[PDB]
Amino acid sequence: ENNTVTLVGKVFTPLEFSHELYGEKFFNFILEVPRLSETKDYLPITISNRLFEGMNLEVGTRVKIEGQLRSYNRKLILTVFARDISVVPE
Template sequence: MEGESKQMAGNILGNNMVNVTGKIVNDLEFSHELYGEQFYNFILEVPRLSDVKDMLPITISNRLFEGINLGPGTRVKIDGQLRSYNRQSPNGGKNRLILTIFARDIMVVSDDEYIKNPNEIFLDGFICKDPVYRTTPFGREISDLLIAVNRPYSKSDYIPVIAWGRNARFCEKLKVGDRIKLWGRVQSREYQKRGENNEIITRTAYEVSITKMEKANKDELISTEQ
């Protein structure tokens, strides 16, 4: 029974895999402690093929970086998972969906070390809201999705996803409950909203941008390989 449980947990871990390489931009900030293990947050600057850089949130256990100096400017490669949780509004407003890359392994790399794909993610999950298809003012097709990705112990991560072009058109056929596999990158974008006192607040949203996707069989076993 114990062996089966470990195998099941390993399979579920394989449905959410992130690999990012970039530079740390701030000092580590203490997040929380769980069963004696301390967790810290920092922002990782990850380059795109263009001049744009994604500023991605990282959560890491102190047990992963013992003896490693993780300060601003340090270039690291991180393997992990994209996790979500709800943050309660202090004023009793709507909860916010918070995303972070939960590090499972970290390695310091040199500045001149070439990384072909510094930002990759694979997800295997289920559509949990009807896809929204639209076109941008420049005529580009885009679909917005929300994917539920299972975690061990009956937990799930809810991850916003966007698809472009032919992938966006493919998403029009998807329904709630459909299982999909997707490959892409984690990206950040700033947006503005108006606060309670009409002040303009700038926030950062995180989402997965799809480069490849396919519909999967609901009964198919989740593979641990990407």
């Protein structure tokens, strides 16, 4: 794909409902992703509740995310629009 993002990090802020698409519910949250130096990046994620059926994404949950870096007019916002998410242990 021409636009792919892979992140491994921890849910830093809780899933917050943004809104719906023809009844599909979307949520935004921030992922904390550590650099080698241990400086952190705080990155915006958007996810459909179709994709995390089965899992809990409470604050502190560690995940691997694959998705698309999107701009959209909300003002213009950037987000990593998740295509795949997996909860992993520490």
